Symmetry: D2
Subunit: 368 residues, 4 copies
């Protein structure tokens, strides 16, 4: 019962992936310190892909073709997930992708653990418009997630009569010049909201930059689908506060399962690992992978797969399940606001988990 | 009533796009020489993008932003369609894409006229396996269509217990060396079928090359989703014969609507324009665009859109319609075999048009 | 005596390459209608690469590997020249590159006919600084020529205590948005000169755009190393006038060889082919290729090569020669100013042809 | 007196760059434990770019724009050096590049410490031909160094009547499939020598792979310009032995300066840092940077630059100097053979350091 961890230690998204890695190691701990899985202990392998799509392929190639791994939890950025996809499909292995993403994808061998666009962007567009205004400017890192993410957010804004003013993209490893030239565009745009699809290290940099270009008084909020406790941990409180984010989970949610997860993360995560929605997603996904295997009583992927769609888990965010119709998960959807002291303060929460709909057709979407 | 034609005149796919352009010009002729559309004549614009995704953007930018065009029929290769997509969405225009493609896409402003993978690959995989063998090797041009096309064909082969031996990719503008090194791989692979996703000019080159590496006697057939009368028109009869292709239409199908279309193409297409399935698709799509506008009595896109999904057309391939749930079309699916004298000889035809399912999940697919 | 013409007919730089193609066809005419070359007539082949580096490779592959061509005149953009380079080197063929370019290259099989940076940028930097100011902003198409061109121009400006304010790059096939966002940067920069390395079709677009952002009164001149009668032919007189350009030749230079070339171009070039410095370069280079072959009395490349470096030609721009130490040419260097009626008005001309120095080390450069 | 170290800790070339980093830290130690530089201690900064050209830019951006660094030693792969180049030129800083590379480059702000092609490939081609045969096959990582490196090696082989059979390229992060498909080509090629321009981690993998495809008996040697004690440290003795490499230095050379450097490296380098030619180059370059600054008595780059070209250093490889005509160094050139027990056994050594000639014109090259 060997699992392969594909989470960067270094690179643009190293902070969030490290939270993710730990969320997964915690799950392993608990499944192990519960007599493991059929009296044998589950053992994990880790390599650092450094956020590079080719190193993810290589690492997933290595794990599968040389250490005989058939179960993987990892990948953050979508181009990184796609590079590993063919590899898992070729070797019949299973990968759990505990992250938010643009949609319009299906792999029989990939379990989608974070929200598809109808699960985060759909609710979020409505909140932003019906609470802050209809003018918005899009700023994203320059890769496939941001671009496809904005594609549907554009559709979403048009549905609700809002207006996309500008669509700005910056390198994943951006220069201050790049940052300064985009912030200026975002300033002069005069929108009511800033929809950020900037990931990793440029997140904090971008938010600070925006703050600073606006000085004293009213500046639009920065809404994002990725910004977590990971990236907020790198910003000044004034810079961070007031910022919006949708995700299935927040370290501060009221409830016994969250606190259970929280007080356990605190007793296991290294100081440079924060507690985020993505660490929550890698935790539940890892549990489920073990639970299914106990139920099958084997570490065969077919035997474990079978049981994957029959196990509902009482995850820190609420009850989750994995639809077999498209391999995505029914997830909670919370829209939290950041404190003047940098805690996520939930403002809205869907009345029940949202079923996944990866092929996003706005008009056939439920109107929040 | 101004329509923008986005079809290459030069470049890798110039032959097929030229057939497409003419299929569309013919439709215009007929809608015009039928009192036009509200007594004004429909007028078309053409520019040659040369198969380059950036020149397609530029051309669609030009047509929309300077000649006030809101209706377009064109694009062949998927990366070319995607480059134009944002442009049509930004300006609220409509583009008809009369071509086969990989799926997993949605735009409110794009009408998908050629088959999605459940419409051609699904039936085709079954035919190839249940008629030629289960061993197959994939050879494609190196861009997004071939790669995503093979992704689902891999799933398809695994469903039916077949085997993908090798996945080979060659540049869109390939050198003989490139061609020779891939053909060798395809030879040594010893498959029962060659699934080609090679497009434009390298098509004929590839097929000839394969033929020639096999000399006298048994060589697997070459099945493709794109090869049409366009590319077969460039190959020797022995090279062409025996080759498989799935598409909604073939210039040689028995029926009064085909012959009607055929004997009219013959009286309008220049000698360097052949009659293909893709010219059939650009013809029906153009008709429908006019018909809807007559019905709306206006060249507004909202007014024409409305009526788009209510007009079933009796296209040369049979009855077609455009589902409003995902903007794709219900299409016929024929699997023809090439003559020793190079005519497509239909061997199989779906009992009714296949409804489109762009989000391809093999297990939930109908088993042919 | 077969020569291969590699000049785009369509695409970003089609206008200039068409002038180039004709400059070369004229040379052929004259060498032919002079009893040819050893009583056999020289025959040319042309294909349209459309400005795409891969199609140039393919075309040069085709010409060499299938029509047995060993002599080529063509290529414009540097990435296009580099794609063909390996091909000519592999097959021992000779290519004449009649164009300006960034330097830092050597091929035994390539004859460099247009200026290296010490031949155009060096003189030009001095003129611009010692005549207009020391503040400059760089705007270029986004490919290897513009970027390497600015690299040395930066060195050059630092030598003479000038200042590079901004370095802006736009796609080869740019959107008005792209154009508008760069012009704005160039406006707000407040430089004394605009150094353009924008090529093909975006040239006119850029110059017009700049003009228009400045309206009435003082706007810095636009200096370029490529802008020719080709691209000026697409601009309004007010837009064109006052603009600077360095090149070895201008259709309007005083002299019997220029007029000879001019009055002959006029009697041979189609109306959509202008008379430029680059058509002058393809003409002299083609002559020399013939002359050497007469002298060798053969169309062998070794035999013709030998004589290449011994033939000084009295080209329309003055006496030229091809140094065997690095395959580049000693060329004239004129800095012309554009008329209010759009004629290039030479303002400066080097006292003798400048010997080529492709490995540009500013400090060891002659100070103009 | 602050110096910025730009050497990967993780990624494709992490092993060699780590040897390089240590070679530089050692130099600092010695200049410091020699009363430093003007009684203040020289202090270094390090960041891990992970072999990614964008992270090198970012890191060099960070070091310069935020920690006020004006002196840098680092970069390995040429695309990584080029990404940092504009940055150092823009901020007037100095970078020492202690590595072998393709040539055809000049920056006033870059000190070239490893050999240009006339310094390693030129001698080496002669040795290989006049000692092993004239048939050769080229295998390289797919980036600018390998490709430009082979460009000149092709010229070199043609000069000496040798033959380039095949030119094969593999990703920097290659799959076994990629490795297996290239080794096969290299096997079937039947050359006398394998010229490798494969760098980092795929080096060992490639050599092992080749060995293993050849089994028992005669297989051509593997000559390289980069393979060092770093990459040989990852291979079996039988795999490593017999292999050729040219570089200015080898940890095993007879001489008091080498042993001095060696016995000091041993007392400072961590166990995962080997002693290589590139660690020798970063050591001498760092010394020189200090020495010049002592001489100028200041850490100004102009003041230090002045003295850079006047200080000849008695480096472990012999006497070195930095030509001010092109910023490259006069270096020793040794061709060593690997032991059956994996020590580099020098077989040839140039009679004096070779002066650098970055603009490589084979015919004007000295014939070894």
């Amino acid at each position: 019962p060997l699992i392969g961890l594909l989470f960067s230690e270094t690179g643009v998204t190293a902070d969030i992936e490290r939270s993710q890695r730990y969320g997964a190691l915690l799950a392993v701990e608990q499944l192990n310190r519960e007599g493991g899985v059929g009296g044998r202990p589950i053992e994990t392998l880790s390599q650092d892909p450094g956020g590079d799509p080719d190193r993810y392929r290589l690492c997933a190639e290595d794990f599968i073709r040389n250490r005989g791994v058939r179960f993987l939890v990892g990948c953050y950025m979508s181009h990184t997930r796609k590079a590993v996809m063919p590899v898992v499909e070729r070797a019949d292995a299973l990968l759990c992708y505990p992250n938010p993403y643009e949609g319009f994808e299906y792999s029989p061998n990939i379990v989608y653990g974070g929200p598809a666009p109808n699960q985060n962007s759909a609710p979020l567009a409505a909140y932003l418009i019906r609470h802050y205004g209809e003018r918005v400017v899009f700023i994203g890192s320059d890769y496939i997630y941001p671009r496809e993410s904005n594609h549907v957010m554009r559709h979403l804004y048009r549905q609700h009569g809002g207006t996309v003013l500008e669509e700005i993209y910056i390198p994943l490893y951006p220069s201050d010049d790049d940052l300064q030239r985009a912030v200026e565009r975002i300033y002069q745009a005069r929108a009511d909201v800033v929809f950020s699809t900037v990931v990793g290290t440029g997140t904090a940099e971008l938010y600070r930059a925006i703050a600073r270009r606006y000085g004293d008084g009213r500046r639009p909020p920065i809404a994002s689908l990725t910004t977590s406790e990971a990236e907020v941990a790198k910003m000044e409180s004034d810079v961070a506060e007031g910022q919006v984010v949708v995700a299935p989970y927040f370290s501060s949610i009221d409830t016994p399962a969250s606190r259970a997860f929280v007080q356990a993360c605190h007793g296991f995560f290294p100081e440079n690992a924060t507690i985020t929605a993505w660490a929550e997603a890698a935790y539940w996904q890892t549990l489920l992978l073990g639970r299914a295997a106990q139920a099958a009583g084997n570490w065969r992927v077919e035997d474990v797969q079978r049981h994957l769609y029959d196990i509902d888990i009482d995850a820190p965010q609420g009850p989750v399940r994995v639809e077999r119709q498209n391999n995505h998960s029914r997830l909670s959807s919370r829209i939290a606001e950041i404190d003047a002291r940098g805690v996520f303060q939930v403002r809205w929460q869907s009345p029940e988990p949202i079923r996944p709909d990866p092929y996003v057709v706005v008009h056939n979407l439920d109107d929040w």
